Write a new protein. Structure first.
Ligand SMILES: [Mg+2]
Lengths: 51, 714, 50
């Protein structure tokens, strides 16, 4: 579990595209989503998921 | 450093972070926890709880039966089903007193439902124990088979087309001296088989519960259905109930009750909340108690109504429980495996079974009749939930300060399985006395509250059917995250359903904006993978990739093509509600627009309205444009009916002559065949008149129509 | 100066005391060119003009 909750060298997720943000809440949502993705775009658990 | 997320509950209160205590997101992939041994344990424990009652011998099935009603008062805290009829009647009397006219109006609505209902409603149930073939079968096929058998046995009341007529037909059947079952052998040659069932055999088959938890036969669907209609009508008018409301109304009910009990509390009153569960709900609900409460409910009513409502508890009180497939025996010396059906379990030695199974068989042998165990006391799940809720609400309503005659008084909800009491009193002695009185009254009525699963804390926090209340904040996790994968109807239907479910979760399920965006991303990726419709530009080398590439190289406005045709995804929190074909209609190329929406394409199929732009999961409705991507996927695949599809074959060729038949339930007094005959004659005449048909076809059509007339007259 | 973001529908104002050290991406071509020209003079939020 400890090795699972740690980061890796490369990115283990390539989530697809969405429509362009227009609404301000869409922009806040994009910000939050990108921050979370960067937070867990390389984590080990993501490697497990993709594999 | 060791990761230990449970320590997180030292800062974030448990209710706030409850999402972490729910492991699975979806159905766990094992689906275990059932078997014949479990049914044996259930029967043994149910008869144990009621053991101190009277033992009688039924005059029809000859099986022993148990009667705990009006039994000796419980002396210990073990679960007891020794309910008293006088006490339940007094509780119902007080409930009517505090809600006058509820029983009467509920009875009127139930009478309306009884009068108007139809037979075909019973094709909307779940897997059903077809007694005719003596096995589980679909509701529709089981109903068709029962209708066939009744027709072959000279019972055709259900032909009228009314559910109560089918109930009268069952009434006629069960008093019949013998029942004849006919079966076909479908290969190599076809034959016939006839079987004769005496009165007792058919009687036992009618009062059986196939266990796979259990499902009764078509004999006992209608009566429970009508009793459920009555219970639902009564509960709809009760504030303390928990059914049959949805997710949004549950929060309102919880908030209302908690505010009512807390604010009304004065500065000198102490309040407590008991979050509780019932020890064993369906194992201590004696059918006689429900019969007594239904008798009280249907006082001063038409006799036919009283009897239709009273049959269900009467039928359930003498019910039989089946013992499933049987047992498996394995020998290591010769690595030899065999299956022993439960039927012979009555007359098989007790050396092949371990100690626990030996005890089970020893206890269940005296109650075993014709391979089925007679379970008079107790009940099964999923049938009398609402009436049990009514009884619980009655005992709760008994708590009003006027009844208690003392300072303490209680209230709260009841959703059958679980509940949440709230008790107000001057001192902690008052709280103790109130809880003691509530517990003793629940015991007298025959209800056991799970002492281990029930805990009491000062008012402000509790739980109720997966709804966690904390100082006004209610957290909902009854269903948890839904399934965001492609549902699997077709391309357009799956896309619309996915976007719509994301939107509905955002509106109701408190889902977040970023969470919705990620869910949309995951769904679009899953869709593209599943349907081999990857982007026309991208190279993934699927079976469909070449044609998508050619299409992409052909068109001009590549932003207009659908996702399933190799186009960009254009959804967002903005336009989740817009159907795809509309959302990018303006961008669509003229030729692609014409082809994709050509209504003469051979890939479009539409079914009856009830299955158009709607999917069954509960059911949900989606919006989509009927394009070339609305195809329907291929179908995958002892029977009383000679041709299982005779009815389906018959309804078809009606839609041909009368397309409107697909849309609205057609109504007419003429038989069908004459309807097709007249329509065909008129159509052929007008077709000849136009000039697109010649003389030979007209002559052939009229000869054929005349011949059909002669065939039907004779 | 006054900046506005149409995407988020927001408005803000910045004083001249912070104009000495600030990004030039916000402003347009002419305004950024003028800022570039006058950057080496702003002393304590006050240009020097002999
Ligand atoms: Mg509870």
């Amino acid at each position: 579990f400890n090795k699972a909750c740690e980061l890796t060298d490369s990115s283990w997720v390539e989530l697809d595209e969405i429509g362009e943000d227009v609404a301000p809440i869409e922009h806040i949502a994009s910000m939050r989503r990108n921050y979370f993705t960067a937070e867990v775009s390389h984590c080990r658990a993501t490697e497990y998921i993709m594999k | 450093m060791d990761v230990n997320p449970t320590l997180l509950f030292l800062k974030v209160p448990v209710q706030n972070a409850i999402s972490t205590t729910f492991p699975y997101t979806g159905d766990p992939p094992y689906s275990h926890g059932t078997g014949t041994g479990y049914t044996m344990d259930t029967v043994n424990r149910t008869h144990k709880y009621s053991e101190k009652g009277k033992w009688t011998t039924n005059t029809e099935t000859g099986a022993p039966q148990l009667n705990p009603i009006d039994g000796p008062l419980p002396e210990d805290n073990e679960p007891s089903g020794y309910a008293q009829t006088d006490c339940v009647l007094e509780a119902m009397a007080f409930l009517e007193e505090s809600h006058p006219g509820i029983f009467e109006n509920s009875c009127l609505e139930t009478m309306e439902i009884v009068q108007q209902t139809r037979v075909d409603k019973l094709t909307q149930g779940r897997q059903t124990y077809d007694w005719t073939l003596n096995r589980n079968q679909p509701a529709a096929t089981a109903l068709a088979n029962t209708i066939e058998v009744f027709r072959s046995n000279g019972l055709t009341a259900n032909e009228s087309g009314r559910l109560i007529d089918f109930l009268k037909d069952v009434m006629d059947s069960m008093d019949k001296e013998e029942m004849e079952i006919t079966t076909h052998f479908q290969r190599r040659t076809i034959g016939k088989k006839k079987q004769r069932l005496n009165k007792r055999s058919y009687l036992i088959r009618a009062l059986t519960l196939n266990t796979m938890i259990a499902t009764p036969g078509m004999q006992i669907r209608g009566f429970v259905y009508f009793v459920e209609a009555l219970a639902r009508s009564i509960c709809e008018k009760l504030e303390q109930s928990g059914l049959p409301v949805g997710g949004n109304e549950k929060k309102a009910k919880l908030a209302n009750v908690v505010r009512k009990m807390m604010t009304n509390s004065q500065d000198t009153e102490l309040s407590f909340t008991i979050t509780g569960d019932n020890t064993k709900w369906n194992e201590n609900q004696n059918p006689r108690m429900f019969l007594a409460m239904i008798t009280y409910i249907t006082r001063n009513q038409p006799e036919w109504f009283r009897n239709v409502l009273s049959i269900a508890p009467i039928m359930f009180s003498n019910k039989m429980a089946r013992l499933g497939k049987g047992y498996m025996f394995e020998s290591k010396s010769m690595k030899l495996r065999t299956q022993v059906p439960a039927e012979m379990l009555a007359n098989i030695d007790l050396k092949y079974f371990n100690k626990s199974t030996r005890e089970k068989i020893e206890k269940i042998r005296p109650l075993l009749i014709d391979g089925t165990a007679s379970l008079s006391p107790g009940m099964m799940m999923g049938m009398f939930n609402m009436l049990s809720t009514v009884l619980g609400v009655s005992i709760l309503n008994l708590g009003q300060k006027k009844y208690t005659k003392t300072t303490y008084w209680w209230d709260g909800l009841q959703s059958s399985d679980d509940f949440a009491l709230i008790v107000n009193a001057p001192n902690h002695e008052g709280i103790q006395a109130g809880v003691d009185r509530f517990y003793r009254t629940c015991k007298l009525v025959g209800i056991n509250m799970s002492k281990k699963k029930s805990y009491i804390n000062r008012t402000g926090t509790f739980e109720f059917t997966s709804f966690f209340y904390r100082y006004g904040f209610v957290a909902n996790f009854s269903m948890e995250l839904p399934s965001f994968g492609v549902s699997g109807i077709n391309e357009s239907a799956d896309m619309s359903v996915g976007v719509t479910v994301i939107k509905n979760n955002m509106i109701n399920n408190d889902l977040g904006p970023a969470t919705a965006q990620m869910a949309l991303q995951l769904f679009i990726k899953d869709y593209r993978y599943t349907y081999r419709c990857h982007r026309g530009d991208t190279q993934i080398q699927t079976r469909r990739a070449f044609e998508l590439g050619k299409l992409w190289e052909q068109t001009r406005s590549k932003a207009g093509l659908l996702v399933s045709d190799g186009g960009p995804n254009l959804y967002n929190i903005r336009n989740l509600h817009i159907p795809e074909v509309c959302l990018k209609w303006e961008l669509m190329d003229e030729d692609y627009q014409g082809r994709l929406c050509n209504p003469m394409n051979p890939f479009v199929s539409h079914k009856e309205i009830d299955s158009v732009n709607n999917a069954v999961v509960k059911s949900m409705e989606y919006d989509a444009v009927a394009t070339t991507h609305s195809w329907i996927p291929k179908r995958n695949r002892r029977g009383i009916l000679e041709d299982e599809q005779m009815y389906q074959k018959c309804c078809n060729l009606f839609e041909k002559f009368f397309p409107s038949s697909s849309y609205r339930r057609p109504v007419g007094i003429s038989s069908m065949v004459e309807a097709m005959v007249s329509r065909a004659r008129i159509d052929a005449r007008i077709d000849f008149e136009s000039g697109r048909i010649k003389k030979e076809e007209f002559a052939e059509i009229m000869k054929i129509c005349s011949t059909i007339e002669e065939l039907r007259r004779q």
